Ligand binder design. Structure first.
Ligand SMILES: NC(=O)c1cn([C@@H](CO)CCn2ccc3ccc(NC(=O)NCc4ccccc4)cc32)cn1
Ligand SMILES: [Zn+2]
Length: 349
């Protein structure tokens, strides 16, 4: 089946969205939380979706499961490990995984997320754990994994912690800072907390990417580029609204992290229209193919090499164009990006 049986690069996938039903059932059972169901396969079909939903409809999915993972040191380290394992199945050679350390903790964070009482798991040692399982999976599974820490739009207060986390843990996997989600809250991009944390990123040489243009206007993409100084765009679909900002990102050539299957189950793209990616194809844009959230969207990388091969005419030459672009625009040190380019060029010819 797989549309592309070659190795892949993936840049845009969220850790708290690539958990296996099994492990949630497992920690929820052995901590008390009680899911909506007790078998592995009926949790999936109510925690995963298959028709566009709404934000609210969408954020409840996390309130099923996140209480049974957060908090527990053991779980935090497990999902990282198991994340690397399931990516190897996808045929990924290099993958950048993103997540918010605060949302996985139940102390030193205000407010405490998901609904949990206080404890002693702090954002700082949450990322250290994740770091562990990630490096553990890498050498157990043969997939190169780096980390991305996410700032939360609605909580500029956590932003300055994230940059520090990114700098303290640089080398230990984490390679950049991110922004999401819900980019429709007014002027979130210009939240002082956010912009000055991104300013710290630039000062300290931390790579930068931003969720922009997925469900927001072309102006959110703008302030991400000109203010937050992003090097990559998360989605960046709506920059088709402003043709001069588009031609200018053609020309700077910026990376768009496309998520095709995500964009339908969210509503970002309506079916009875261009998909933003066909245009990036025809126009030779720098872009990638990515999964976003394999748990919530019942999918694997192969569901969206498939959707593009099948409903939109991608052939395998663009498939491989797009994975060498993804490798180029990776947040990898100049030497390592170059050993990864070497592997792929030879694997593809
Ligand atoms: N798909 C995603 O955007 C997404 C975000 N996360 C995590 C972080 O790794 C954040 C979870 N989260 C907590 C508050 C919050 C607010 C908004 C969003 N997501 C968002 O607004 N996505 C756009 C969207 C619109 C409509 C439907 C579905 C998604 C995620 C949020 C996981 N998946
Ligand atoms: Zn995302």
């Amino acid at each position: 089946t797989p549309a592309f049986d070659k190795p892949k690069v993936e840049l845009h996938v969220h850790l708290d969205g690539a958990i296996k039903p099994e492990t949630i059932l497992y920690y929820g059972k052995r901590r008390g939380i009680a899911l909506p169901a007790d078998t592995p396969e009926e949790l999936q079909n109510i925690i995963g979706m298959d028709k566009p939903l709404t934000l609210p409809d969408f954020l409840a999915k996390f309130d099923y499961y996140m209480p049974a993972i957060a908090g527990c040191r053991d779980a935090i380290k497990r999902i990282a490990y198991e994340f690397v394992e399931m990516k190897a199945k996808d045929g990924v050679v290099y993958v950048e995984v993103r997540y918010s350390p605060h949302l996985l903790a139940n102390s030193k964070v205000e407010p405490i997320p998901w609904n949990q009482a206080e404890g002693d798991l702090t954002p700082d040692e949450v990322v250290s754990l994740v770091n562990q399982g990630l490096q553990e999976g890498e050498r157990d599974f043969g997939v190169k994994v780096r980390s991305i820490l996410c700032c939360m739009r609605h909580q500029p207060s956590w932003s300055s912690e994230v940059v520090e986390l990114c700098k303290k843990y640089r080398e230990q996997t984490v390679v950049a800072i991110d922004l999401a989600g819900d980019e429709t809250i007014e002027g979130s991009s210009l939240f002082p907390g956010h912009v000055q944390a991104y300013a710290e990123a630039v000062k300290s040489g931390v790579h930068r990417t931003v969720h922009a243009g997925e469900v927001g206007s072309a102006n959110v993409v703008k302030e991400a580029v000109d203010t937050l100084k992003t090097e990559r765009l998360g989605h960046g679909y709506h920059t088709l609204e402003d043709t001069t900002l588009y031609n200018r990102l053609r020309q700077e050539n910026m990376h768009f992290e496309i998520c095709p299957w995500s964009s339908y189950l969210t509503g970002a793209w309506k079916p009875d229209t261009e998909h933003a990616v066909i245009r990036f194809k025809n126009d030779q844009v720098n872009y990638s193919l990515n999964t976003d959230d394999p748990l919530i969207f019942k999918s694997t990388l192969d569901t969206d090499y498939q959707m593009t091969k099948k409903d939109m005419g991608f052939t395998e030459e663009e498939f491989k164009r797009l994975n060498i672009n993804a490798a180029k625009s990776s947040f990898l040190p100049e030497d390592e990006k170059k050993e990864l380019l070497d592997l792929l060029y030879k694997a593809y010819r």
